[PDB]
Design a protein around this nucleic acid. Sequence first.
DNA 1: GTAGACCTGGAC
DNA 2: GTCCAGTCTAC
Length: 273
Amino acid sequence: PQLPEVETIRRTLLPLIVGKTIEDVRIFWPNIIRHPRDSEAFAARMIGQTVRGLERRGKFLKFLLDRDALISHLRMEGRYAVASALEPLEPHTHVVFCFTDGSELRYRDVRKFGTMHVYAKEEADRRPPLAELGPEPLSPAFSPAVLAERAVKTKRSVKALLLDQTVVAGFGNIYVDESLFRAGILPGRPAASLSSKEIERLHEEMVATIGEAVMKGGSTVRTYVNTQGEAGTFQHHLYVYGRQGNPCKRCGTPIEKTVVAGRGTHYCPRCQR
DNA sequence: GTAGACCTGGAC
DNA sequence: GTCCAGTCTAC
Ligand SMILES: [Zn+2]
C-alpha cells in the first residue's frame, strides 16, 4: 500500500474503531512489533486505552489512543479488518486488538513484512519511523522547489529519488512509474539531469496522480481493498504499471519493463525521454 | 548504487 | 520448479 491505499484504509477504518477501548492485544508473530521490542510490553501498555483518532503520515497509519500513538506500516500486504471476537480468525492474522465491546481489530499480513511501533503521542513524530519522513505530497510543504533541492544534489535515478520517503512521503512503485510516465520522463534518468521545466512537470503530475488515486480509493492490482473489502478503482487508470507488452494508451508503443533501483519498472519508450 | 534479507502464495 | 510482488542492511 502507498499513500492512496493507506488513506483509503484510514478513512474507512476510523469510524469502525473510534471510541472503542482496548481490553487485550494478542500477538502471533512477535517480529512485527518493533517498539517496544518486547511484545509483552507493547500489548500491556495499550490495554485500557481508547482509540481517539486515526491519522496518516506517508504510508503509515497513526492510531491515536489516550497516552500513546500506534504507528503501523503495512509494507507489501498488510491489512486491517474489524470483526467479532466470537468468530474464528482468518489465516495470516498476526496481531489482534480486542475491544471491550466484543469486537476486534485484526491485522493480517501474509508476508509478515509489516511493522508496529508504540510511543507516547508527543514522541511519535521525533522517533523512527516517522522522524525522517519527507513532506506530504498533497500539502504546500511539497513543492517543485523541494523536489529540485534533492534532485540537483544526487546522481541516482529519478525513480530512486521519488521512492525515497525522506524526499517526499507516500509514493511507491505504482505511483512513481505512473507519475514519471505522465511527466514524460524516463525512470532511469539521473535525477540531476532533470531541467527546471521537467521538475515542475514531475511535481505537477505527482500531485495530480496521487490525488486522483485517493479519489478512486487506491489501486487494486493484487489484493488491496479498503476496510470493507472493497477494491479501489485507480488500477483502471494506469498508463504503465503492470502493462508491459500492452500498447501505450497515448501512442500505442508497447510498454516495457526493466529493473531500475532494484524494482520492476514500467515505462513507454516513446512518451518518456 | 546494488544483490541479498524477510516471507508467502499466485502465475508461468 | 522458477519468477514476482517495501524498508532495513551489507559486499
Ligand atoms: Zn507512449
